[PDB]
Symmetry: C3
Subunit: 63 residues, 3 copies
Amino acid sequence: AMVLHGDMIVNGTVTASKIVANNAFLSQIGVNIIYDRAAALSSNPEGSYKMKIDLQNGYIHIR
Amino acid sequence: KDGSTWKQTFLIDAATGAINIGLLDAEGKAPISFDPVKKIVNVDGSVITKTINAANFVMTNLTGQDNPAIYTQGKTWGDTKSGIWMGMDNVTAKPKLDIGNATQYIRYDGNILRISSEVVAMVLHGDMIVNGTVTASKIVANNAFLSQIGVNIIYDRAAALSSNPEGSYKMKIDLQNGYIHIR
Amino acid sequence: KDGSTWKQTFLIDAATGAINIGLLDAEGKAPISFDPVKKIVNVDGSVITKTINAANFVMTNLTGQDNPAIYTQGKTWGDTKSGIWMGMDNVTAKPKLDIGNATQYIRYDGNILRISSEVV
């Protein structure tokens, strides 16, 4: 329900439950456990990937 | 009396109970003339109106084809003009409405609405547990306290916000073909 | 008749076609008095109204400075009050509108709108 005719400097909080886009010129990030859309958009986001860099427990799994 | 024109204004006739006031323009009627026979209360216009007591909202004398409505005469739901229309339309049995032009406006029908316009179009005064689907085409933010992720081929905003998201980066971890390129 | 005040209500004069009803408050007029000479249909107020047939929407007798509009008397587009205003404003030639206060409301002008509010 957001039809856009201008540029938004949001003075509130931009929350959400899902996100699809083509790119993102962001400022600072957060990604707990590196899946990929090689698996995410693909079925089972824990599906076909080659290396999942989880920064929580010294986890560099290389495939 | 006037010239050869016996202009008559007030009348009461003991033949049909007709009660007439004001000059005549109709074939046998005047703006505020009356006819208790086949009773009808006919009036029009009010220079001063500072009050009502009931709504004066519905339209009747035709249950279906006098649609209850307060609207701009000469414009309705589907006109390119920037006029207005409100009330309970009865050709659809439920309210029609349109405020503004045909591109930057608010349209409504008794069942659904069409507001093809923005606002500064998500202004937020509360916290959202979205019960729908939050889709999008682009995203810019300062951080994200997410739950689960997806990132096909690890670029960086060292390249993404920078020109050519395939631009200046140092290691692109694509999880699709055993691709760890280190620079 | 009353006291030394000959309060007159109904009248018809064969000098100017004047048709008068009700007590007088104006200089030479009454709420539902009439004057077919320089014709005018003047009335006001209706205790019972359960019907209309045409909109009763436009405002005329001044093409530009009687703006076609149904609105709260004493408030319009740009007032901090929480009143309302609707219709085809003619000082801008197109509809003005505002429902609610000056912070949590919906504003509109014939061309554009300003709804500085949320929804869930």
